[PDB]
Amino acid sequence: SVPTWNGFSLYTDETVRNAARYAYDNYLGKPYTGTVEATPVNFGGQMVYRQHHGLAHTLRTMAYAEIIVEEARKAKLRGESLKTFADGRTLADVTPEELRKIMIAQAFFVTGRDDEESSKNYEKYHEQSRDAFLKYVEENKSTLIPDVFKDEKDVKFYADVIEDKDHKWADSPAHVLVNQGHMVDLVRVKQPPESYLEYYFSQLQPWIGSTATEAVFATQRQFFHATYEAVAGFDSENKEPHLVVDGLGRYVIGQDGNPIREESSGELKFFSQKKKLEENQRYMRVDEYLKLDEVQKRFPGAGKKLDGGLPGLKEYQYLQRLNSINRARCENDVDFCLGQLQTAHHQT
Amino acid sequence: MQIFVKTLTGKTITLEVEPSDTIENVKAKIQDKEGIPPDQQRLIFAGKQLEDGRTLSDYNIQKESTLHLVLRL
Ligand SMILES: Nc1ncnc2c1ncn2[C@@H]1O[C@H](COP(=O)(O)O)[C@@H](O)[C@H]1O
């Protein structure tokens, strides 16, 4: 039941491009009004007001939604079984028209932010993002309705995804693409990179399968390089403590060289970072976690080493690239950033 | 006392330090070995960002401790 494609592409479809321009012009390129990391930065002569959740971040999430659907479609054509929603659809059933509407919603998903304040203003920023999207649709209803959004009912659905009132991140193909697209962009900052990558992998994999998921994260590395953003390393022999991403916790090796498990082998018991350990215990290391065969079963990270940054560049030199005027153009120029992503996409 | 400083790019910097050392001192050491300006260094331990003026023992940073070096822009 895979639909035929009609040449739809993030890098050529003008509706999607115009949504991003509007979002940048009215929201993403404006100074933060809040207090949390609201102060802008100068990159090689140009100001960038929102370096964490700006234009480049937003365009990359749209770029992720596209490759995720592409890789899902290929997975289902290979005969793979993908996770289903309550109506029986999979990500591989997403139509061109649907993906366009999803991407438009994505372009507004962080327009409502007044700063990088976390958690505390969740509802306010999400509601403000919804409002931005609704204002955009209204001002452009003559071209958007009914050709892009069928009716006002279709609009509200995507409005609701943006607002995210009940955090149903897995409720529909739109919910998964928007929320996981937003989420995985954090691969550009999260440490330790192995723990975070294994976690994100586990969130995306059931929807599109392992092969597709590997391809998504491999392409992401190109997307980061192309938009002058940090490319993480991956070291299966990382000896630092493993971070349990869900809850920001730890696992513990006992006095005996055994992971502590709940009565069953049972689940590894979650350990708060704060809580103290009986003597002779120690946190589980990243390398230990990756060679757990329950982890190896679901994640091909063991025995894998990936070089971060840019090969041949000393770390400080890689900094200068990240700090460049090119990064600034990505954050302030829709056409340029989309151009960078399009080249990355082809490179495959 | 040796601590380990890790970057997103997968680099690990092994530093020979002692609890008395302040965070500037550590940043200077990082610049000595890797040529990264202290200006652009953000050190994190236990999810907490380390402040220049204070020392390692102030944050209960001990031997074989792992720190994150986040790059400041
Ligand atoms: N396990 C997950 N599945 C789907 N989306 C997620 C998951 N974890 C986080 N997200 C998304 O990422 C957002 C958090 O982004 P941030 O504000 O950068 O922490 C959440 O509100 C969700 O939209």
Short mmCIF file of C-alpha atoms in Angstrom, two decimals, chain A residues 17 45 47 86 106 126 133 222 228 247 265:
data_model
loop_
_atom_site.label_atom_id
_atom_site.label_comp_id
_atom_site.label_asym_id
_atom_site.label_seq_id
_atom_site.Cartn_x
_atom_site.Cartn_y
_atom_site.Cartn_z
CA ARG A 17 10.33 26.63 1.26
CA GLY A 45 30.39 39.35 10.93
CA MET A 47 24.43 38.02 14.05
CA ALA A 86 -3.90 2.52 15.63
CA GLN A 106 7.84 21.43 11.35
CA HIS A 126 4.15 25.34 22.05
CA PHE A 133 1.39 28.44 12.27
CA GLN A 222 26.31 14.65 6.26
CA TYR A 228 28.69 23.74 9.56
CA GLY A 247 15.68 9.72 33.33
CA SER A 265 17.69 -12.03 33.31
#
